[PDB]
Amino acid sequence: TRFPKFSQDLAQDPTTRRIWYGIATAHDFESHDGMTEESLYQKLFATHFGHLAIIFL
């Protein structure tokens, strides 16, 4: 069960808790597997562009 790919703790859960917690922790980028500080700020900068674009749409 590869969703959620950012958390192998959640991905190996065999229950429906895997789906709910994958949704709830998806934007908690600091707690994801393999996250570094530099890749966090780079992901945020681009995510903020996407949120800006939603405001203009």
């Binding site: 992901k43 681009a46 995510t47 562009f49 996407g50 674009a53 749409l57």
Partner: peptide, 29 residues
Amino acid sequence: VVSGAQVAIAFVVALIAGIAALLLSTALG
């Protein structure tokens, strides 16, 4: 008024924003 040509133009602009959103959302994942 917003003529039928202008609705069609707006969907073409929206399609280009759609593929741009598609580029960003796959680069984010």
